[PDB]
Amino acid sequence: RTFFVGGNWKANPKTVQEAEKLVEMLNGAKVEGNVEVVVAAPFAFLPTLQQKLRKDWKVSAENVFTKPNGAFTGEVTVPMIKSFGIEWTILGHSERRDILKEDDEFLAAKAKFALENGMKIIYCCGEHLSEREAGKASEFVSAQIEKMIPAIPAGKWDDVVIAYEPIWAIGTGKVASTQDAQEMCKVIRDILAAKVGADIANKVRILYGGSVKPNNCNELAACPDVDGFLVGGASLEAGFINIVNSNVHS
Ligand code: NA
Numbered sequence: 001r002t003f004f005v006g007g008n009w010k011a012n013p014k015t016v017q018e019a020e021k022l023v024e025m026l027n028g029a030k031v032e033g034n035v036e037v038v039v040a041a042p043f044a045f046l047p048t049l050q051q052k053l054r055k056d057w058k059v060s061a062e063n064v065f066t067k068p069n070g071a072f073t074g075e076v077t078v079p080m081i082k083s084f085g086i087e088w089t090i091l092g093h094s095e096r097r098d099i100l101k102e103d104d105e106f107l108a109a110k111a112k113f114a115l116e117n118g119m120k121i122i123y124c125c126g127e128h129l130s131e132r133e134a135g136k137a138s139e140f141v142s143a144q145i146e147k148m149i150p151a152i153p154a155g156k157w158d159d160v161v162i163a164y165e166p167i168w169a170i171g172t173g174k175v176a177s178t179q180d181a182q183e184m185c186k187v188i189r190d191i192l193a194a195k196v197g198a199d200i201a202n203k204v205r206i207l208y209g210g211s212v213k214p215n216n217c218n219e220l221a222a223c224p225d226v227d228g229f230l231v232g233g234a235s236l237e238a239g240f241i242n243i244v245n246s247n248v249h250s
Contacts, residue, residue, distance in 0.1 A: 003221070003247035004161055004205040004228035006038045006060065006122055007235030008090060009045075019045040020052065025238060027054045035228070035247040038088050038122070039235070043076050050084045060088035060122070063096060066109045068117075078117045089114055090230075092124040094165045104144060108151040115156040122230060123148055124209060125188070126165030129172050137168075138187045145191050157200045162188055163209040163230040170210075178216065181208040182223035189225050214242035221246035 013019055019041065026039070040060035041049050049059045065075035081089065091114065092107040107123075114121050125148075127140040141164070152160055164184045169176040185206045193201035208220055209230035220226055227250070234240055 001203060001205055001227050003033070003035045003250050004038070004207060005035055005244045005247070006040060006090070006161075006163070006207065006228070006230045007240055008062065008093070008230055008232055009039070009041045009235055010062070010095070010232065011042060012236055016045055016048060020048060022236065023049060023052045026057070026240070027052075029241040029244070031056075031241070032245045033248040035244055037244055040088070040090050040122075046081070046086060047084055050086055058088055059084075059086045060090060061086060062090050062093070064089045064091070064110060064114055064119070066106065066113050078114055078119055082118065087118075088120050088122065090122045090124065090163075094124060094126060094167045094170070097124075098167070104147040108147050111148060111160075112151040112153065115151075115159055116153050120159040120161070122161045122163055122207070124163045124165055124230070126167045126184075126209070129168040129174070132166075132168035132174075137184065138191075141184065141187060142191050145188060146195065149195055157196075157204060161205045161207060163207040164188060165209040165230075176210045178219050178223065181210060181220055181226055184208075185223070185225040185227070212243055214239040217243040217246035218249045221248075221250040223250075226250070 037057040038060045040062045061081050065077050068077055068079050091110050096102045111121055125141050125144040127137045131137055131140040166176040188206050189201050205227040207228045207230045208226050212229045212231045213234050231243055
């Protein structure tokens with residue numbers, strides 16, 4: 001598996017002029033090793049990233065809707081994204097599940113629609129504090145992945161990346177360890193192996209999507225089942241390149 005680093009800008013930066021400055025910084029970064037890099041940005045900034053970002057990396061949307069077009073005011077759709085040459089989207093990020101109330105049925109429909117229309121997806125999952133403290137993390141994450149699995153069209157697993165988010169460690173007063181990252185990425189790989197087979201489990205990149213910074217990326221990357229990262233705030237900073245370059249420890 002090729003190490004994979006996605007930079008999720010989330011709803012940032014505030015201005016397209018800042019977005020262009022960030023792209024200029026990224027374009028001069030010296031990448032070491034072997035790594036697949038994707039940068040996800042707000043919809044309004046996708047055209048300028050697609051125009052200006054280094055072509056050895058790829059641009060990603062942060063969401064898409066379930067339909068090609070139509071009477072869905074405010075939604076952006078897969079064909080719109082693709083018409084710029086953009087090939088990636090994030091789906092099911094904890095912020096969209098938990099704040100914008102996207103449920104698993106909605107997300108499964110997005111995954112199917114995106115994949116059957118030639119997108120690649122970064123599909124996010126992860127358990128909350130109650131399930132973590134009950135000792136039911138693997139059961140919760142399995143339920144999420146089991147909803148995702150039937151949505152993946154035949155022959156499309158090459159275009160699926162899964163990100164694990166330790167939601168239990170976001171705004172809760174608890175922090176995740178490196179061992180927690182390894183354990184939960186391994187849990188996901190074992191769910192894949194049991195439900196769709198070892199061949200698929202061995203090729204799907206499973207990312208850690210907790211807090212990833214220059215000070216912990218190397219140790220996280222070295223974990224055997226951690227295939228990369230879905231990076232939050234550090235993707236807006238020069239430290240993103242440290243994280244990209246952590247692949248050499250994997
Ligand atoms: Na690794």
